[PDB]
């Protein structure tokens, strides 16, 4: 299928092709795409969780972001 880990099964979790933290496919409008690793993250799964999608051009996930 498109994803060899979950075989695209909508009823299966997948941290590769869906939210990298929870594996959920819901709310794609709230899944930020990391501008380094291209993994998806629900705004609400992040720590800290964000109440809305950031305005800035680029976004980096917890695995890729530089130390603050």
């Amino acid at each position: 299928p498109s994803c060899k880990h979950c075989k695209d099964d909508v009823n299966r979790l997948c941290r590769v092709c869906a939210c990298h933290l929870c594996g959920g496919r819901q709310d794609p409008d709230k899944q930020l795409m990391c501008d380094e690793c291209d993994m998806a993250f629900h705004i609400y799964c992040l720590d800290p969780p964000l109440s809305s999608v950031p305005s800035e051009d680029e976004w980096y996930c917890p695995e890729c972001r530089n130390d603050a």
Binding site: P28, D29, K30, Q31, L32, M33, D35, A40, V53, P54, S55, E56, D57, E58, W59
Partner: peptide
């Protein structure tokens, strides 16, 4: 930021 899907 990019999202998996956008309103537009």
């Amino acid at each position: 930021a990019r999202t998996k899907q956008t309103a537009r």
